[PDB]
Design a protein around this motif. Structure first.
Motif, PDB file in Angstrom:
ATOM      1  N   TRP A  54      -6.331  -2.331  -9.870  1.00 50.69           N
ATOM      2  CA  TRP A  54      -5.051  -2.122  -9.081  1.00 50.69           C
ATOM      3  C   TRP A  54      -5.271  -2.549  -7.606  1.00 50.69           C
ATOM      4  O   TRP A  54      -6.374  -3.351  -7.155  1.00 50.69           O
ATOM      5  CB  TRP A  54      -4.878  -0.688  -9.151  1.00 50.69           C
ATOM      6  N   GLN A 104      -8.745   5.485 -14.787  1.00 52.80           N
ATOM      7  CA  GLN A 104      -8.041   4.878 -13.959  1.00 52.80           C
ATOM      8  C   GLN A 104      -7.821   3.375 -14.113  1.00 52.80           C
ATOM      9  O   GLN A 104      -6.850   2.652 -14.021  1.00 52.80           O
ATOM     10  CB  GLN A 104      -8.479   5.100 -12.255  1.00 52.80           C
ATOM     11  N   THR A 105      -8.860   2.665 -14.424  1.00 49.38           N
ATOM     12  CA  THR A 105      -8.883   1.078 -14.579  1.00 49.38           C
ATOM     13  C   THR A 105      -8.752   0.768 -16.129  1.00 49.38           C
ATOM     14  O   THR A 105      -9.657  -0.287 -16.611  1.00 49.38           O
ATOM     15  CB  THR A 105     -10.098   0.547 -13.958  1.00 49.38           C
ATOM     16  N   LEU A 148       0.787  -1.089  -0.085  1.00 51.21           N
ATOM     17  CA  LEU A 148      -0.054  -0.059  -0.007  1.00 51.21           C
ATOM     18  C   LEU A 148       0.691   1.183  -0.051  1.00 51.21           C
ATOM     19  O   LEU A 148       1.969   1.341   0.405  1.00 51.21           O
ATOM     20  CB  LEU A 148      -0.941   0.037   1.417  1.00 51.21           C
ATOM     21  N   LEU A 161      -6.488  -1.106  -4.711  1.00 51.05           N
ATOM     22  CA  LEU A 161      -7.745  -0.682  -3.817  1.00 51.05           C
ATOM     23  C   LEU A 161      -8.947  -0.890  -4.661  1.00 51.05           C
ATOM     24  O   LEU A 161      -9.997  -0.453  -4.275  1.00 51.05           O
ATOM     25  CB  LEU A 161      -7.382   0.584  -3.450  1.00 51.05           C
ATOM     26  N   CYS A 162      -8.916  -1.670  -5.896  1.00 50.17           N
ATOM     27  CA  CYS A 162     -10.384  -2.150  -6.405  1.00 50.17           C
ATOM     28  C   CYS A 162     -10.825  -3.240  -5.799  1.00 50.17           C
ATOM     29  O   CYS A 162     -10.130  -3.892  -5.230  1.00 50.17           O
ATOM     30  CB  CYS A 162     -10.185  -2.464  -7.885  1.00 50.17           C
ATOM     31  N   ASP A 163     -12.124  -3.587  -5.968  1.00 53.07           N
ATOM     32  CA  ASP A 163     -12.767  -4.568  -5.303  1.00 53.07           C
ATOM     33  C   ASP A 163     -12.301  -5.814  -5.696  1.00 53.07           C
ATOM     34  O   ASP A 163     -11.613  -6.107  -6.767  1.00 53.07           O
ATOM     35  CB  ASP A 163     -14.343  -4.602  -5.708  1.00 53.07           C
ATOM     36  N   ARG A 212       0.648   7.527   1.042  1.00 51.83           N
ATOM     37  CA  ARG A 212       0.135   8.707   0.606  1.00 51.83           C
ATOM     38  C   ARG A 212      -1.369   8.890   0.512  1.00 51.83           C
ATOM     39  O   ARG A 212      -2.167   9.685   0.907  1.00 51.83           O
ATOM     40  CB  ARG A 212       0.835   9.634  -0.901  1.00 51.83           C
ATOM     41  N   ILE A 213      -1.849   7.588  -0.009  1.00 46.81           N
ATOM     42  CA  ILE A 213      -3.367   7.443  -0.255  1.00 46.81           C
ATOM     43  C   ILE A 213      -4.155   7.453   1.389  1.00 46.81           C
ATOM     44  O   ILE A 213      -3.660   6.105   1.743  1.00 46.81           O
ATOM     45  CB  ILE A 213      -3.567   6.249  -1.109  1.00 46.81           C
ATOM     46  N   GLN A 214      -4.814   8.100   1.741  1.00 48.27           N
ATOM     47  CA  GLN A 214      -5.441   8.001   3.228  1.00 48.27           C
ATOM     48  C   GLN A 214      -6.906   8.176   2.971  1.00 48.27           C
ATOM     49  O   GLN A 214      -7.518   7.666   3.994  1.00 48.27           O
ATOM     50  CB  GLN A 214      -4.735   8.872   4.128  1.00 48.27           C
ATOM     51  N   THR A 215      -7.616   8.782   2.102  1.00 49.75           N
ATOM     52  CA  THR A 215      -9.065   8.890   1.716  1.00 49.75           C
ATOM     53  C   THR A 215      -9.349   8.605   0.551  1.00 49.75           C
ATOM     54  O   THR A 215      -8.627   8.914  -0.350  1.00 49.75           O
ATOM     55  CB  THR A 215      -9.219  10.288   2.434  1.00 49.75           C
ATOM     56  N   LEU A 216     -10.554   8.422   0.388  1.00 48.43           N
ATOM     57  CA  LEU A 216     -10.871   8.246  -0.909  1.00 48.43           C
ATOM     58  C   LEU A 216     -10.946   9.413  -2.003  1.00 48.43           C
ATOM     59  O   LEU A 216     -10.498   9.157  -3.124  1.00 48.43           O
ATOM     60  CB  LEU A 216     -12.718   8.021  -1.182  1.00 48.43           C
ATOM     61  N   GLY A 241     -16.841  -6.959  -1.938  1.00 46.29           N
ATOM     62  CA  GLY A 241     -17.060  -6.042  -0.927  1.00 46.29           C
ATOM     63  C   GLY A 241     -15.542  -5.510  -0.069  1.00 46.29           C
ATOM     64  O   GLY A 241     -15.678  -4.915   0.871  1.00 46.29           O
ATOM     65  N   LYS A 242     -14.563  -6.326  -0.628  1.00 46.54           N
ATOM     66  CA  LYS A 242     -13.348  -6.072   0.026  1.00 46.54           C
ATOM     67  C   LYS A 242     -12.243  -5.398  -1.020  1.00 46.54           C
ATOM     68  O   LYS A 242     -12.428  -5.781  -2.139  1.00 46.54           O
ATOM     69  CB  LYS A 242     -12.634  -7.346   0.734  1.00 46.54           C
ATOM     70  N   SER A 243     -10.949  -4.717  -0.275  1.00 42.54           N
ATOM     71  CA  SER A 243     -10.035  -4.493  -1.604  1.00 42.54           C
ATOM     72  C   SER A 243      -9.280  -5.484  -2.032  1.00 42.54           C
ATOM     73  O   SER A 243      -9.237  -6.565  -1.243  1.00 42.54           O
ATOM     74  CB  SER A 243      -9.090  -3.331  -0.527  1.00 42.54           C
TER      75      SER A 243
END
Lengths: 313, 311, 312, 316
Positions: free
Chosen positions: A226, A193-194, A143, A228-230, A146-150, A301-303
């Motif tokens: 990537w 992004q995808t 992970l 953090l996709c489902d 830097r990425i901490q919020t949507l 429903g999960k990363s």
DNA sequence: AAAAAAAAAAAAAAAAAAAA
DNA sequence: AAAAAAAAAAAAAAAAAA
């Protein structure tokens, strides 16, 4: 035999890495592409400084970069890449001089210069695509802090300005955020992004990713999504009857589109950012196109990173 | 049998302040720590001038500082500290020369110089830890005016560059923001605004903060959080018999796991803020004598809680 | 009828013969669009817009000028056929490209001044009809330019001529630019939801009123658009076997709207709405009926999604 | 007698508007200041074009501006302002040429050029202040459609790029938005939205706004707040014993010092942008206070909870 | 843990420096 | 009310622009 882009990439990689360039390893191809991209933005030590509108600190940094010795020959790059003695010749020949623009070359009218500039742009695009793919692959197991919020995760991947310029439709980050916040011109591209990106060993051969290909779970997942996709996207893989490290692609996700849910205020009303939940938000469904046909697979429903880590357990 | 880190600071404080240095008053320890920090950073009057790349105003300021009379014995520093005649010798012999770099000291090979440089570095780390604790303590009753929005409050404490250069993991401020807005790597450290710092009177003697040791409410609150943190942390302190402004610690909060559980929207799915999952119902984990417990948040900043409960 | 509608009726007749049906929204919209293209010199074999056109624009204008003009009997839309007289009309009523009212006024020719005024009124009517058609189309299929409320605020998105003709109703890029220009007496505030009678009612001066037979989609387009609140559907009541026909039972107010924000200042706390002090889905709209104003609770879903779900 | 800024503004307005410049009217002074600002930014027709990095559309617009005839003597501006025959001389003399930079002039070393550049900078600042005050005054009676949410209202007043460059500490808009969103340098200034701006009739005389001055309600309010600020500020006015239309200022509001109700996240908790709002209460919101400095002393006035524009409308 | 290394005697408004 | 003006025809990749 192959389009211009893949041909130029293969030629450049062979010239700069000789026979040490493996053509069947994702990591080696990624390292070669990243090194070549570094070689084309005027970022390596001993290259022309960037001082057109540079702030004093930037002037100092660029002067220090220029003063420092450039990388030497026989230098080890990445894990299993060694520079050849003739890499300097390729750098001096096929690398446009700093500030080179297509307008000036076209005004000059030199066919060789125009072809070299076209090859440079194509190599930039291919290396940027490979670098974005490798960023996706890395995010599948490590992970990013830097990425901490949507709000922050919306701009992944974070890549340098030249990377954004080469492929504005795929590369996010600070430059993409500024472009989205600023005025939207005729050349504005939304950050897809995808988007699909074939693995490195296919992206240099032209074999577009498709059903029936034998690929690893991690590489396919980094190609189509990537970190953090489902996790439901993992359904697009099937372990083989042999070792199991390399399976087969059975189906690919389909990009849903449309269906905005906004309600503008009128007649004394107030705006609604989203008309919509828990039951549908959790289960949900994703359209996966398989060889037989489209199938609706409920989201896990999960990363994806969490799913891979749990499976590795 | 104290570690060399604390032994160096104790010896320096003794040499510089004689008997006027009380090792039981937090304000006095903090004043002495700030004095030693400014001395070893070459900021006292009559010390070397920072004119390597000083601008016109900065050059003039440094030249005036050098020209200004240096501190003399008997000078009052704070409320209960008095300089001694030995401070000049301590500064001359222990303070490395301005611009000295450990590269040159190691290249020379002098063991004494290497030891002095290591002692100076450890002393700077200790004084920076003490200064950070003092900033937390002060912000419990008077907030920095630079703190107006969550963006500004994310970088407390606001200490000069040298402090950050000493302990990057604790000191925020302009330099921490600059490092945040710059490149990142292995040497990059994260600002931990709530990293536990033992109080000065406990820090200089090596005593780690633990459940059951006598402390003040402000002391513990500054030693585990700062003015604007959630007031629930006040539960870690319990007054003794008759209170008397002195109580005892009953727990120490645990840290938050850095794992990110986000799931970004894609392929038409809806974004999820937390895959595991009310705002005022959130609970903090407190390690008590028995075990970990969950305490509901109070929802108010420690500064506001102290202001309201003052009377 | 007022000259504003009389000019449009006369032009439509002279251009389309008897094929111009005056009771179908689609036919009227197609005729209005064709007339707007004709008077904008956008048809084949018409003038070339070459005042400051770029190389490619200049080439395309030259090609359009060289391209053969439409001939009599051409099929336009679905139920409109041109008449041989149209050319004569296009030769007479259509002002020459680049003509400005200043030159006409300086000339002093009364006939030319009246022709220019008729052209302006025709352009205004055509732009209104185009706006209504755009709302009707948006009621089923949404334009992709609108993704956020900020973009949705400027719907409809029409060319500069449309905004110039009726600045009050048309929006688009030019309205966005005028918003950033400056404020004065001429400045008119955009009204995205002004009552526009359907084309079959506009060309005959049939102001929309309670008790008029109109399709549900017709009324929704005439008093709202695709992304509005679904509660507006309360204004329409079906008839025997519906059959895509009903009746208007009431109309929403003209929806002026004042901002009740109170921004924080001098330590006071910001208020998102002054009235609410002392629920998001509980908001209601005011509908004036034959009896009086009533409050109808909002549905919470956009009209587009509501219609899509109702269809199937 | 007067500082440099007010003197230069008076000189410029007198030269450009002759004897038609009324010195005791707010609207006339505002129109004069706005016109001087437009003249000094090279935006009047018949002035140099801006093409250094202009996009094709911008190039076309600037070329059209350059081609068009410049304003002629006697042209009517605003409501009661008429240009004099000698405005062109002033525009040619006192306006730095397009692209002029203080560094180049300083390197040149011409004293007259440096003084002219300083006067131009001062006039830019004064005209920006006047136009900001006028934007406030307009907001007291005519809402703005651009402002639909607190996020948008946070950037009022909206003004052009050069307006933001001249006075970053008061002017908001797109450029303040970009500066705040982007990197914050050593020259960054926060939008002091409700600073105290003495009326234009005083702003050109130097008589700082203070207690005892005779001023209207609308002008005073636009000076110490804008359209959507809280209504309690109206308490800063005391109607006079006569007609009562024009009154006197009793006390000025004090920029609060001590409200830091934030709560930053720690140990897994979540941030709170404002404790009171997240407390799910209305009693406090109706019982707030504002610190009005009066002649006798500080007073705490309870907030009325309604926008200033709405209160003004209801009073009328 | 080892390594590397800007009007609350001393924290808003206006001025000279920098520059929808 | 007036004036001033890959769902015959809507994503991915290439050559234009940067």
């Amino acid at each position: 035999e192959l389009p211009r882009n893949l041909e130029v990439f293969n030629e450049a990689c062979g010239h700069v890495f000789g026979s040490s360039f493996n053509r069947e390893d994702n990591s080696v191809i990624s390292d070669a592409a990243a090194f070549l991209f570094k070689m084309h933005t005027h970022s390596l030590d001993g290259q022309e400084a960037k001082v057109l509108r540079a702030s004093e600190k930037k002037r100092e940094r660029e002067n220090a970069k220029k003063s420092r010795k450039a990388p030497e020959a026989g230098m080890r790059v990445g894990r299993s890449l060694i520079l050849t003695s003739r890499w300097t010749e390729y750098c001096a020949t096929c690398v446009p001089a700093l500030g080179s623009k297509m307008k000036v070359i076209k005004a000059s009218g030199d066919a060789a210069m125009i072809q070299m500039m076209k090859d440079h742009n194509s190599l930039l695009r291919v290396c940027v695509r490979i670098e974005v793919w490798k960023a996706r692959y890395v995010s599948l197991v490590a992970l990013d802090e830097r990425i901490q919020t949507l709000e922050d995760a919306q701009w992944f991947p974070y890549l340098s300005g030249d990377s954004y310029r080469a492929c504005p439709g795929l590369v996010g980050g600070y430059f993409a955020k500024k472009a989205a916040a600023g005025e939207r011109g005729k050349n504005y591209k939304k950050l897809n992004q995808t988007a699909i990106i074939p693995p490195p060993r296919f992206l240099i051969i032209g074999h577009r990713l498709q059903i029936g290909d034998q690929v690893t779970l991690r590489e396919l997942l980094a190609s189509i999504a990537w970190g953090l996709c489902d996790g439901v996207l993992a359904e697009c893989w099937s372990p083989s009857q042999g070792d199991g490290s390399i399976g087969v692609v059975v189906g690919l996700p389909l990009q849903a589109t449309g269906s905005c849910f906004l309600v503008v205020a009128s007649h004394g009303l107030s705006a609604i950012a989203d008309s919509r939940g828990n039951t549908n938000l959790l289960e949900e469904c994703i359209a996966i196109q398989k060889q037989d046909g489209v199938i609706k697979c409920k989201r896990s429903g999960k990363s994806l990173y969490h799913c891979l880590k749990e499976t590795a357990g």
